[PDB]
């Protein structure tokens, strides 16, 4: 398997979503994970990064609304979404980056959020 | 496969502190006794600390008693070792080990080991 | 299509166990006591090629739990009509009785291990057993195919969950192979109890595998042994010649006509035509595999101990440590017998260990085993032993 | 000596958290390991060590039909390492998404490259380097300079070759690069790519135990066999003897079980571990067998006809190795005899299907434990019978 | 240690939703999967069943409105839900059933489905 | 770990038809030549059909050519065998195997095998 992105959907401004990045294997729990998004007509955009240790960093456009976390037993890295706006409408992908910075998997189908 | 991964080793000043983590995969973490063991330069294996499956009980060696603290988060499947007042005699590769039998007669033996994290105090 | 008793068991499992989780019963008597919640034990193995079987200790899990109470409800499964081969005596029906996985959540919450732990449990801990509880049985409704009578309610196959006890009781539906029932205290202090891998022969396989190839090397008359040793003396001091010799001995005609001492080795494995004698090439290819694992400094030392007749001490020294450190994926502290020391930082045997990845100190006979040093150490012993075999 | 090797292990332990990186064997081999390099893994020759990867100084772009430059490598984090004047390690990796575009924009060149047949002939598995850990220029404390860009460790992805080429980032352990056609016929030679040593390994575990028989004075070998003949014809006595050796002094059993145990104790009746250990192994092997097999073993032992079955079981086990595989075995002509024959029943009791009008007997992996236990039992009884 | 359920949420009538039942092991592919639902204080009911070979069964209250499917490569069994109406608010759980009829895992936490 | 699970067997009418499935897990299915093999009483193992990794080439033994069709659904990690015009000599246990080699000698070795499912033509 590869990363499986789910949880996306259609909402109206101000709403809230929670997307899932699931790894059948355990690389998600030993390496870093990032959530990207390729917004309609716009290029793929990194949304949140989570280091192997759990250090979080976000982009300016999403601070105060998005929270990235990890559930080891579920091999899941989540994207808690709040105060969603149509500027957040996109298909969301996740990827894994090793401590050396190399990516582990190619992209999954992603999950669409439409606000 | 069983995989134990230690992180957190490094260089600290004497009297400093370090916290080691050990993430576990390949087995039911909450069902296994866990340990921290270090390999000092030129020295044999020194068992440091142990913890019950649920964490309600722990055990420490004298060399680190009061200084180090062993803990586990069974919901996150992680083993930790907080190390305080480190001195150069605490410089070593630190291992987490699953199910250790430190038979006073034969020797220390554990079922699974991590790759180790180097702790250097200078 | 069953025919005999086990052959019937084989087909029942082949038909009903899609995931391969079931344990077949081997004899009709053994099926006694194997009911839902019987405690079964698997004693430590003495062979890597067969493990002792699960056996009921004729105890139920409720017998070790506080608040004594009747076993919880069982859940009935599907029934299957095999109609058999070698209400009908020819016909057989087998059904499933299983424990719901959610039963453990409530049960282990309603009830608790007798902290004056059951007398029998204290026996199993001393005997080193892992203890399991039966979670499913496939059983017959009525007696069947009786020149061979099978009483009703005979278990054909079963599933278990492993017990784990650390001042408490939990039931693991999917444990790993290494999981222990009797967890050690926080102190790691135990006593003579079967432990540490259900036995291992890591060292035993290596000595024999070397000896077989050493025995395959007995095909050489001592004359061909000498010229081969003359050829072996050379490539060990020539890293690149060693690589070319190994490549000349891979899969696909007449051997590569290598110049230099690598040629002499090849001439020991061919007829006047230059075509390999496989039974002669086979053992040599093995040794080159061991040597290719070693380092240049190891190669250089192996030559000098060969010429100095000093291959014997190192062979013994390596052998004991491989004996001591098995299993070699585990970490352990070995002990150097001074009765085999022949020592010093520059000692030839000292250097062979450093090249394997071990760090040695002058103030102690203890050496920590590094699992990453397994291959080179084993190849080192293989080289030493085989080179000793040529004498 | 040992210098570059110590640096490699340190870097991996610090940077390889997942255990995915392959250490470089020697500073000699450290060069040439670059992203997109092709390395090969020839078939192994030992249970106890694995062959080296070997960069074959060929690149994956060279075997893809549009011959063009390789895609970019991902320049990764730099790492500044510790000594107390330093060593800096940088990551070059192939993005996993590179292969998807590459293997569609290019396709494996037909006819195949010359090298691939050579690797196919030798049974090699073929991989491509997907990441390297490399240096800048510095010296080793050891004194000896490591050139800039020396690979310390690398990651690989396996190539699989069929009508087309694919790159597998996480292949399983048995995966082969060179796949057979739908025919299953791989034209040209054995070029096996497999090896078991299952039977020879079984012969070794047996021999550990066997050599301990001759230490018995021949009377003890004699009393032992007679006690065994008795327990072989008594299932519950056999089990009681088995359970007596799973334990203070010994349990005072009468009968053939007592005859066996009497061979194994001291004046004090305490444990005699040097004696029990081999016996417990034999009892373990016999316990694997059925009641019918036990009584035949007693008969074969009393009749001293152990060889005929012993040779046949070993033949079949050696034919069926590896025993987790299915295969068609061949009965060596001349028992090297249909239903009712002792060997027939002995092999029938293991789960195998024998035919009187056919030499064919297929191997049943479920019979692996019983057959191996059966092979061991025959041998050990023969030894005490000398 | 068990199955993981996701996909629940809050939608307006006539929406669309498809839950996920993900197995860390291969049992979801060799065995059958069933979806249940519990409203607080009432009995657990089966809504849809999927065998390993792909045979679907549904509850009449949802027949023609729910679809149980499996993605073998994802190790996930879906419950596509349609004609969403009240009385479908409940705690929805998935399980795995062996060919012999036994259950593989204990219940997970479930996924929240709310309709109004 | 590699798992190969066969279903679809049973007792069939002579001249009838059956469809066997074989689900694969534990390896990259789409990268492996796959096969069906059977074991008939008194007979050695008989390879019946083979299919390439992508499924663009297939092979059949004469004994089953034209009657049986091998196929694979790579997206679901499943191998199939359609059986038609079944005859009494087709009674056997049918196995799906991974990567089968028949080139060297009349012989058969395959890397991985399934548990088997019974097929009977009454």
Residue numbers in the entry:
A (entry chain B): 2 to 116
B (entry chain F), F (entry chain C): 1 to 122
C (entry chain D): 1 to 86, 113 to 172, 205 to 246, 273 to 336, 340 to 428, 431 to 480
D (entry chain A): 2 to 85, 116 to 173, 205 to 246, 273 to 335, 340 to 428, 432 to 481
E (entry chain E): 2 to 117
Question: Could you pull the original sentences from the published paper?
Answer:
Human Gasdermin D (GSDMD) is a key mediator of pyroptosis, a pro-inflammatory form of cell death occurring downstream of inflammasome activation as part of the innate immune defence.
For this, we used a GSDMD construct where the linker region between the two domains (residues 247–272) and residues 184-194 in the NTD were deleted to prevent precipitation during crystallization following a previous report. The positively charged CDRs of VHHGSDMD-2 bind to an acidic cleft on the GSDMD surface involving residues E15, D17, E21, D126, and E162. A pronounced salt bridge is formed between R99 in CDR3 of VHHGSDMD-2 and E21 in the GSDMD NTD complemented at the opposite side by a weak interaction to E162 of GSDMD. The buried surface area of this interaction is exceptionally large with 2615 Å2 (counting both molecules), with the CDRs of VHHGSDMD-6 targeting the NTD of GSDMD, while the β-barrel side of the IgV fold interacts with the CTD.
